[PDB]
Design a protein around this nucleic acid. Structure first.
Lengths: 103, 610, 158
DNA sequence: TGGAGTACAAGTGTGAGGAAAAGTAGTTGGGAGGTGAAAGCAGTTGAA
DNA sequence: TTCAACTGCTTTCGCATGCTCCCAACTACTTTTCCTCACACTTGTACTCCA
């Protein structure tokens, strides 16, 4: 195996500045993750973990939840985005799990 | 005197177990290494406060912005009174504003009166020289360097009735030779970029540079750090850069390049210790205590210790300690990247005998990092020391007495917006949850009074039947849609999808709902072996998942009871992805897409090999 | 020092310095034209005209340890085998091996045939090996004090 | 009142900066190699 | 004449042999192909000050 098929295949650099989501954009474009599979996330399994990390009283679980219901058009369906076009990662934070973190 | 020298260099790195045996048969320490032996030295702060107020580089032409040392004015050159400690520092907008007593610590005076002389140029260096013990006094003058000028001031005869510190002056001698000057020392002796001169100081503030000077100009040195000091009082200046040290006598005509540090080091800082002979030099990779020579005071390079931290912006402060049989010399290096310190304890004995102890470090305040650390002369084995710092991205001057005995602006200045129509409409959601939290505590309390009833049991009887119709429809909704080669809700019901309140009793329903199905096209993923990413440990039952969550929010909530029930139930409304088809569904598509590629793609699509 | 300052279940620290001067010690010439990165001469390599910092460390720390078991012949033979014919600091310690012999042997515990004219070698080895320390380059020794040490050894020789 | 310029935003277009195991580069510093007598005695020529 | 001469050949055993690398060890800079997204212009929709 040649000298650059061994270095790409090893863990040379870590994913940085949101690099991990941006390969999921090429993974949602080279095959469309929409209209084949389902891009719905279990966002309650997300927020269950984030409460006991910071150990606020669990009142903020629904207080976060009323925020997400108020902002999201079509309340449910914090879906994952697709990008099939080019290298232009959109500057919108279109990814589902990152939207929960800003909420 | 020991044995270790070379005549040009003299080394003792960290725990080399150095080269200075003599085999003294005196039956008490039969070796005289360059190392001491004693117990530890832990350092604790005594914190106080004194006063207050492109991006990937730093301009080395700045040296200091503050100085503070004991002074002896003309009235103290006359009377019995000797010693008042002052401070000379900068403040204001661009640092161009130029402006005491010791109760138990160092503190600013009671009369809160500084001497505000106005300066029309940014300040690059503030220092007072300090005098020698062969002239008997402590010098009353002060020399500073601006960006546009070079101004020399002088303190004269302060008061005690109001603690009034007043200044006389020398004039701003502007750049008649138009080159920026770098580091001054008095002990108008100046170091311009590459060249230098010896000046004359006037006593006449009622209205200069001699014809002896030189240069060290290195064409192969691309920085502009320069540095001069009087060395051993015989009109010998030491002119530095980040490449070499030149020894220049400006009274005779005799120049010498002494140190040459271009190969694997540089010169970072050179603090002139108030001692006449012993003076430290800080390089990178090594801390040098090169003193002067006994016979002929030219230069004698003495015992040194290596320094592992590497950076381009390292400086040093060094404070003596007088003891009866010896003299300590602590060595605080610091940088502009981090908050850490590094210290070493040398020792000077009577026959120019040097030793060493070891190294330690302390911690500091998390607002920025230091840029300049200044020690206190303190007017004169239970070691003590005192100093004061100044951090970057700050302008406060703390106080420390070390002895042997995080809010970011962008996370704060982004919120709290100041409009009038938008002043309470953000809180409309705050009024919305108070419309829903008062609601959704009464809707659950319908079910909380229901405990082991028949009135709540008939809901689950309808629940096992309302899911059972649309799911066998969904099982055959996947056989009609099987000729595809091209999905899970658990919200098929519409009654409430919230109307039962028990952790053990719904598990009796769903496991019986699991014993309902045995045919193909219906498959259920695990829950007692798949929930466990939250507790990060064993979850032997879904019921005892709630058990320690019941032991979790006891003190932090009103009544603490029903919310922990309903979120665990909401995971059953969220984690339960239970509509995977059976084995005809992957197998019909693990071979069909395997046919879309040829025989080259077959064997390169391979598992079950290890 | 983590083996030298442990001394509880130790490997004595001096076996590791023996590991250093057995595999890294090379007598190549310092070629000086190649641009050295990540290996630097003055504190980790051991070329000709530059005895290694870890090689002369294993000299002093195995003579201080050699005193503190009271084996001197085990190192006096061992220093004899390299002709480090450039540096002067290894000639002082090669004199200092015999200077510890002429201090330890010159006791005699009587209150006399071979012990008197064996030390007369060890005085003569310190005197000739200190002169070749002065014959080489810059490394000054207190050779006025050592002859005050050596004559005090002679006071029990007589 | 009916019609023009402030700028919230948004997708279009073009290369550039980063990574590493490999290789060739530049010196040395070793190593074994490989490119007549002791005495005859004769014949013949010796030479001014 | 008288003489050397130097060439020739023979036992005795015999002693008995006489252009400079090529490749290791160090090291270093360069080789080879890959990878993830910044800059800027432009375009839209809006509400301002327009007679």
């Amino acid at each position: 195996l040649p000298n650059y098929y061994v270095s790409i295949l090893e863990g040379s650099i870590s994913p940085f500045n949101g690099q991990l989501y941006n390969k999921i954009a090429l993974t949602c474009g080279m095959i469309h993750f929409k209209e084949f599979f389902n891009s719905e996330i279990s966002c309650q399994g997300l927020l269950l973990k984030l409460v006991m990390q910071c150990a606020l009283p669990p009142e903020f679980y629904f207080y976060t939840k009323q925020v997400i219901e108020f902002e999201e058009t079509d309340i449910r369906n914090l879906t994952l985005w697709e990008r099939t076009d080019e290298r232009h990662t959109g500057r919108v934070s279109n990814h589902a799990e990152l939207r929960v973190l800003s909420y | 005197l020991g044995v270790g020298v070379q005549g040009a260099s003299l080394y003792c790195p960290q725990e080399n177990y150095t080269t200075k045996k003599q085999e003294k048969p005196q039956w008490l320490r039969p070796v005289d290494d360059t190392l001491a032996e004693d117990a530890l030295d832990l350092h604790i702060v005594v914190k106080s406060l004194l006063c207050d107020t492109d991006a990937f580089f730093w301009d080395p032409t700045v040296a200091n912005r503050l100085d503070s040392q004991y002074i002896q004015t003309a009235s103290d050159l006359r009377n019995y009174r000797d010693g008042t400690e002052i401070i000379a520092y900068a403040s204001g907008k661009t640092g161009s504003v130029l402006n005491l007593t010791r109760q138990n610590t160092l503190h600013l005076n009671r009369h809160n009166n500084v001497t505000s002389i106005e300066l029309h140029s940014p300040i690059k260096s503030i220092k007072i020289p300090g005098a020698s013990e062969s002239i008997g006094r402590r010098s009353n003058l002060v020399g500073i360097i601006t960006e546009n000028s070079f101004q020399i001031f002088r303190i004269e005869s302060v008061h005690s009735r109001s603690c009034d510190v007043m200044v006389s002056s020398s004039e701003p001698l502007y750049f008649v030779e138009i080159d920026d000057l770098q580091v001054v020392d008095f002990a108008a002796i100046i170091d311009i970029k590459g060249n230098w001169s010896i000046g004359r100081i006037p006593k006449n503030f009622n209205n200069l540079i001699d014809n002896l000077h030189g240069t060290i100009f290195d064409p192969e040195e691309l920085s502009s750090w320069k540095r001069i000091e009087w060395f051993s009082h015989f009109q010998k200046i030491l002119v530095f850069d980040r490449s070499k040290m030149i020894e220049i006598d400006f009274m005779n005509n005799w120049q010498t390049e002494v140190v040459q540090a271009k190969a694997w080091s540089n010169i970072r800082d050179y603090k002139r210790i108030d001692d006449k002979n012993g003076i430290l030099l800080t390089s990178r990779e090594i801390i040098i205590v090169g003193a002067s020579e006994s016979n002929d005071p030219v230069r004698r390079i003495s015992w040194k210790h290596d320094l592992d931290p590497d950076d381009t912006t390292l400086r040093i402060t060094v404070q003596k300690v007088k003891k009866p049989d010896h003299i300590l010399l602590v060595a605080f290096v610091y940088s502009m990247r981090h908050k850490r310190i590094y210290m070493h304890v040398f020792s000077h004995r009577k026959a120019n005998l040097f030793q060493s102890l070891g190294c330690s470090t302390v911690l500091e305040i998390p607002g920025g990092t230091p840029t300049g650390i200044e020690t206190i002369l303190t007017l004169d084995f239970e070691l003590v020391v005192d100093f004061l710092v100044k951090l970057r991205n700050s302008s406060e001057v703390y106080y420390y007495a070390l002895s042997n005995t995080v809010d970011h602006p962008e996370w704060a200045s982004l919120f709290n917006n100041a409009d009038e129509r938008e002043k309470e409409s953000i809180g409309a959601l705050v009024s919305q949850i108070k419309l829903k939290e008062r609601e959704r505590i009464s809707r659950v309390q319908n079910l909380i009074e229901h405990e082991n009833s028949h009135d709540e049991d008939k809901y689950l009887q309808d629940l096992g039947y309302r899911l059972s119709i649309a799911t066998n429809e969904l099982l055959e909704s996947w056989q009609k849609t099987k000729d595809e080669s091209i999905h899970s809700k658990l919200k098929n019901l519409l009654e409430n999808s919230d109307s039962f309140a028990s952790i053990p009793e719904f598990s009796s329903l769903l496991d019986q709902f699991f014993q309902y199905y045995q045919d193909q096209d219906v498959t259920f993923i695990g829950f007692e072996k798949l929930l466990h990413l939250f507790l990060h440990e064993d979850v032997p039952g879904l019921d005892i998942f709630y058990n320690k969550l019941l032991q979790c929010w006891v003190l932090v909530s009103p009544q603490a009871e029903l919310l922990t029930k309903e979120i665990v139930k909401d995971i059953i409304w969220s984690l339960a992805r239970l509509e995977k088809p059976s084995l005809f569904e992957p197998i019909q598509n693990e071979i069909s897409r395997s046919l879309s590629g040829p025989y080259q793609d077959i064997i390169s699509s391979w598992d079950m090999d290890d | 020092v983590e083996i030298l300052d442990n001394l509880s279940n130790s490997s004595s620290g001096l076996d590791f310095l023996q590991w250093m001067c057995q595999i890294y010690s090379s007598k190549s010439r310092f070629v000086q034209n190649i641009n050295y990165r990540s290996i630097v001469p003055p504190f980790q390599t051991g070329s000709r005209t530059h005895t290694a910092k870890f090689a002369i460390t294993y000299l002093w720390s195995s003579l201080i340890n050699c005193q503190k078991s009271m084996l001197i012949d085990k190192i006096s033979e061992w220093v004899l085998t390299p002709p480090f014919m450039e540096d002067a600091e290894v000639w002082f310690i090669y004199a200092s091996c015999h200077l510890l012999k002429a201090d330890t042997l010159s006791r005699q515990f009587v209150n006399r045939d071979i012990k008197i004219n064996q030390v007369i070698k060890h005085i003569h080895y310190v005197r000739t090996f200190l002169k070749i320390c002065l014959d080489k380059g810059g490394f000054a020794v207190p050779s006025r004090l050592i002859e005050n040490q050596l004559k005090s050894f002679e006071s029990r020789l007589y």
